[PDB]
Design a binder for this molecule. Structure first.
Ligand code: DMA
Ligand code: DMA
Ligand code: DMA
Ligand code: DMA
Ligand SMILES: [Mg+2]
Ligand SMILES: [Mg+2]
Ligand SMILES: [Mg+2]
Ligand SMILES: [Mg+2]
Lengths: 357, 357
């Protein structure tokens, strides 16, 4: 019903689920409670809840509030379950990218490491933090599936979810695998970074949540097609925006420290275009960027690389692509009959995702 | 139908599933194919397939071959899906315990690390191996769920699987969390190590596979109870046997190098009893064991710790517990009507699991 009120509903569904696990986790033991509490806080103090939002929009675009005989609570739990996949993805991503900060706060492995300092116990706290976090992510992923399966959605509705759900989870992990193979090979092709955006972000963040929601409502293939097309375009633009924010955005907007993508050495489309341009502009600048990415750590060294990147003209090219993709994404909403209210919310979601931060 | 022929059927179901993923993985890109190939080999050159075996036995104990109108292929895929959970568990366990060898061959993270030496590319190969393996495990876990959900089991059968399936996956990850919290706190209580055996092994390896199989067949609560009781006892004994093998077993039997549990410093019931005994016997020996576990690496230093452990009398106490649990586990098969052939196979499975290696 509302873009700003929906995340609170998501938090309620999640709190309910986490509470329901407490006795089983307790029966295993108090240290598992301590581990799950770190997952609980990471999940409950979440981001914008963009993925459940899109699932809910997809449900409403397919006219679920009028036609669907699924229980409301069941649909909301299915939408909210995506936050557990997100938890898995982010916790594991942060180990892989070895980041210290997520959402303005310490990453789960960093936070578990700081619990081992207060205990003064046996073993390396850094490896222990990583260890607990691998398992915390596994638990989150297992709980995503449970939250969907035990939602109370009918057997018919659950069977309809398969295409979106099967698609999404392979696509996100596949995209994350492609990402780190680009980081290891120091890759500079735009087209391979494009594939990462398509699978690791677009499918997972926008296209498949919409598909999932529409499928729960029993949406027609024509409705689903338009939503998937919207999700592809807006989803890629969303990632391109986050790439720009990961370099040029204030820490208050991103959660991370300024230019953390340079620290991590992420192989964005921005970087690929920047290196491509700097090879034809200033060999000294290209070399400066190449030596910097994935190595430098001081604020001053990040800023120098960043200004070299900006001086290529790459940022403007990314901005143009964002604008083009936002425009074509929005246009797909006019290809089918969608209720006025939902179309308006889908438009504002897109604009907020790609342009308005 | 057969204990020795069933693992080949499992391999066939798995090969079929993995082949079916190839186009989706290819659409993402060639490096994801390379990553999945490492998971494919790890899964296809598997162990004894004990978990699908027990699921199949549970199905047959509930008289599925006579009464069930589920497709045979669907039941076998559900049984085989447990190998993907195992893959997830083992790949992630090997990162956490930092082991180099699994099943006589290099661990997935060690093998991915050796692929980065042949490429001579950017970044630390050790962290990259761990990185790919975290995601390889995530993919395995996601594929376990898919293989079950898309098995072709009816909506009725899938709804019946929930208790075993929900139970198992929380219990295994929970048990793995409790395990590393015992390793970090250098814990020496028998009762906390018991809980790890109960949840990380018994539930996951024997009790819940049996429950899953019986549930697919629509087994009565009385049949399921007897199988769960058998699974509890035999499952704990199975872990206790593997603890003894992890110290006193030949590498040809275990896959790992001799006494790798001492290298890893695993907090087994054997070690807890050994330290408890050595405190009342020889303070020098207790201290020798305490300084050794999780630290020493040379064959000679492992053997010294091992002989100190054996000299406590702890091994004999574990052997007695194994024998007691095997006897009470087998007895539970007589508490309900189970077909003669299946009861005989359940007996031989138990004996092979706890005594006969
Ligand atoms: C690029 C990418 C997938 C970022 C994570 O998404 P998000 O910004 O929605 O994260 P959060 O859950 O913190 O809102
Ligand atoms: C699945 C997923 C998108 C994880 C985030 O990857 P990332 O490192 O690209 O995003 P972030 O910069 O938010 O860590
Ligand atoms: C203690 C424990 C759970 C060991 C792994 O089980 P397993 O011996 O069945 O492994 P594999 O899959 O190699 O047969
Ligand atoms: C889920 C599970 C049992 C993983 C194996 O743990 P472990 O380290 O006790 O077994 P292994 O000795 O086979 O690594
Ligand atoms: Mg990251
Ligand atoms: Mg990343
Ligand atoms: Mg291990
Ligand atoms: Mg272990």
């Amino acid at each position: 019903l509302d873009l700003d009120k929906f995340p609170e509903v998501v938090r309620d569904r999640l709190t309910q689920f986490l509470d329901a696990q407490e006795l089983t986790i307790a029966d295993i033991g108090a240290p598992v409670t301590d581990a799950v509490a770190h997952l609980r806080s990471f999940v409950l103090n979440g981001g914008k809840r963009i993925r459940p939002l899109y699932a809910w929009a997809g449900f409403l675009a397919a006219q679920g509030h009028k036609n669907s005989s699924e229980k409301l609570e069941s649909v909301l739990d299915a939408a909210a379950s995506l936050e557990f996949i997100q938890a898995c993805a982010l916790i594991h991503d942060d180990i892989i990218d070895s980041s210290d900060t997520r959402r303005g706060a310490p990453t789960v492995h960093r936070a578990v490491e700081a619990d081992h300092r207060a205990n003064n116990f046996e073993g390396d706290p850094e490896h222990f933090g990583v260890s607990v976090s691998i398992l915390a992510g596994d638990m989150a992923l297992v709980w995503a599936e449970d939250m969907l399966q035990d939602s109370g959605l009918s057997a018919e509705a659950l069977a309809r979810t398969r295409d979106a759900w099967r698609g999404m989870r392979t696509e996100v992990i596949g995209g994350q695998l492609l990402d780190i193979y680009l980081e290891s090979h120091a890759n500079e092709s735009v087209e391979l970074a494009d594939s990462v955006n398509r699978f690791k972000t677009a499918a997972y963040t926008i296209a498949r949540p919409l598909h999932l929601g529409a499928s729960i409502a029993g949406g027609s293939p024509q409705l689903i097609d338009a939503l998937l097309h919207y999700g592809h375009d807006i989803g890629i633009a969303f990632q391109l925006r986050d790439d720009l924010l990961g370099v040029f955005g204030d820490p208050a907007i991103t959660g991370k420290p300024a230019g953390d993508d340079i620290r991590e050495g992420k192989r964005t489309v921005l970087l690929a275009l920047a290196l491509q341009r700097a090879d034809k502009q200033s060999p000294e600048a290209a070399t400066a960027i190449r030596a910097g990415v994935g190595k430098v750590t001081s604020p001053e060294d990040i800023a120098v690389i960043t200004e070299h990147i900006r001086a290529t003209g790459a940022e403007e090219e990314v901005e143009q692509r964002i604008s083009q993709l936002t425009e074509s994404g929005l246009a797909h909403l006019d290809d089918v009959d969608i209720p006025d209210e939902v179309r308006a919310q889908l438009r504002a979601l897109a604009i907020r995702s790609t342009e308005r931060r």
